Amino acid sequence: GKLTNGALEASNVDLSKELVNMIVAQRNYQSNAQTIKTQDQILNTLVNL
Amino acid sequence: NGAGLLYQGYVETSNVNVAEELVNMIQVQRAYEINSKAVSTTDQMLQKLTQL
Fold first, then answer.
1. What is the rounded (10 degree) CA torsion for B24, B25, B31, B37?
2. What whole-number distance in Å separates Cα of residue A33 and Cα of residue A2?
3. Are A45 and B22 a contacting pair, CB within 8 Å?
4. A40 interface with B at CB cutoff 8 Å
5. What is the rounded distance in angstroms from the CA atom of residue A19 to the CA atom of residue A26?
6. Can you tell me which family this protein belongs to (chain A)?
């Protein structure tokens, strides 16, 4: 396509989408940590008999 | 010909599950402890028979 002199392209990012993705990623990371903790406890109860 | 596939950058871990290993350890310990009792009882019977 045609070019345009005297102009520069933007960063093509959206702050709101990035913020909501950050929140969802944090929640998912904590949810996985909950599974890790559950596995830790379920093995600790078995090893201790 | 039934050969498997290859994945780059992965590694194949062991197929050992500690959860069943611990209970199997309990089972084998109990079985060993029981089997020792037969030896002890046979020894006691022989000792009693000797003292006639």
1. -170
2. 51
3. no
4. no
5. 11
6. Belongs to the flagella basal body rod proteins family.
Nearest to A39, CA basis, from B50, B43, B17:
B17
Exp. method: cryo-EM
Resolution (Å units)? 3.2
For B18, the token pair is 């500690």
In chain B, whose CA is at the least distance from the CA of A40?
B19
Whether A19 contacts chain B with CB within 8 A: no
CA gap B31, B38 in Å, rounded: 11
Q: How far apart are CA B40 and CA B46, in angstroms?
A: 10
Task: Name the one residue in this structure whose structure tokens are 């002890």.
Answer: B40
Tokens 């379920």 correspond to what residue? A42
Per CB-CB distance under 8 Å, the chain B contacts of A49 are 26
- What's at A47, amino acid-wise? V
